């Protein structure tokens, strides 16, 4: 997360860490949707161009975390994956279209003050909230600045970062890049005229973009950090997987398995 701030304890009890067994590595962010399911970006598990094709046994899920590096004894919970599901139409080839996947835990996690699921949106929530200018929140242990040789300093945070960003109109998103945009994606970030900074970044993928509903006091997962061109660049916006639009696939998996 670039230009964010340290999260507060318990602020995002749904934040999950995709951790690789060997070598130890922070793979990506994720989200807790129930006591046995986690939602994440497909490219976190499958992305041929960089050689990723992970299986249920190469990973671990760590929930209730704050510190990126610390083994938080008696706070964090470590779970094993039973099975992973990738949307059958995910497109790694060209634009990360349909960048989403589900992971079924081997056993359910017990909820605590640090572990609690986020809500998946319904039509109503999706319509009232996913509007240009409304702000959402993004969290993760990803890079603090775009990788660049001229950078001096630490690019990794010690604790979970958070940043709030406004939703941007579809036609502004489309004009800012040359990647083909689809409706299974939405963009967020400040416009040049707002002269503000903030963004998700490498290592933030799979993390949730949530919104809080004035109608019921609850937090809804509206997007998944998917891709960008740089981090915090002028005139660019971050892209997120449109969760509501892929919700039918989500329910079918959970219902079947």
């Amino acid at each position: 997360i670039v230009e964010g701030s340290d999260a507060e304890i318990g602020m995002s009890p749904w934040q999950v860490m995709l951790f690789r067994k060997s070598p130890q590595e922070l793979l990506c962010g994720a989200s807790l949707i129930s006591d046995r399911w986690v939602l994440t970006a497909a490219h976190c598990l499958l992305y041929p161009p960089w050689d990723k094709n992970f299986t249920e046994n190469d990973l671990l899920v760590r929930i209730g975390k704050h510190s990126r590096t610390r083994y938080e004894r008696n706070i964090e919970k470590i779970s094993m994956l039973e099975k992973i599901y990738i949307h059958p139409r995910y497109n790694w080839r060209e634009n990360l279209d349909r960048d989403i996947a589900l992971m079924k835990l081997k056993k359910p996690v017990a909820f605590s003050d640090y572990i609690h699921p986020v809500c998946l949106p319904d039509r109503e929530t999706a319509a009232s909230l996913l509007q240009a200018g409304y702000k959402g929140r993004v969290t993760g242990w990803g890079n603090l600045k775009e990788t660049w040789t001229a950078n001096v300093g630490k690019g990794q945070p010690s604790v979970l970062q958070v940043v709030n960003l406004p939703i941007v109109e579809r036609p502004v998103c489309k004009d800012s890049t040359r990647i083909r945009i689809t409706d299974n994606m939405f963009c967020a970030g400040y416009k040049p005229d707002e002269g503000k900074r903030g963004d998700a970044c490498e290592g933030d993928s799979g993390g949730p973009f949530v919104m809080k509903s004035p109608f019921n006091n609850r937090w809804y997962q509206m997007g998944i950090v998917s891709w960008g061109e740089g981090c915090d660049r002028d005139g660019k916006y971050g892209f997120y997987t449109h969760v509501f639009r892929l919700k039918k696939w989500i329910q079918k998996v959970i219902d079947q398995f």
Binding site: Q24, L60, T69, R70, Y71, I78
Partner: peptide
């Protein structure tokens, strides 16, 4: 820089 976790999981 990751602190070691229980081998079980590992």
């Amino acid at each position: 820089d990751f602190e070691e976790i229980p081998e079980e999981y590992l």
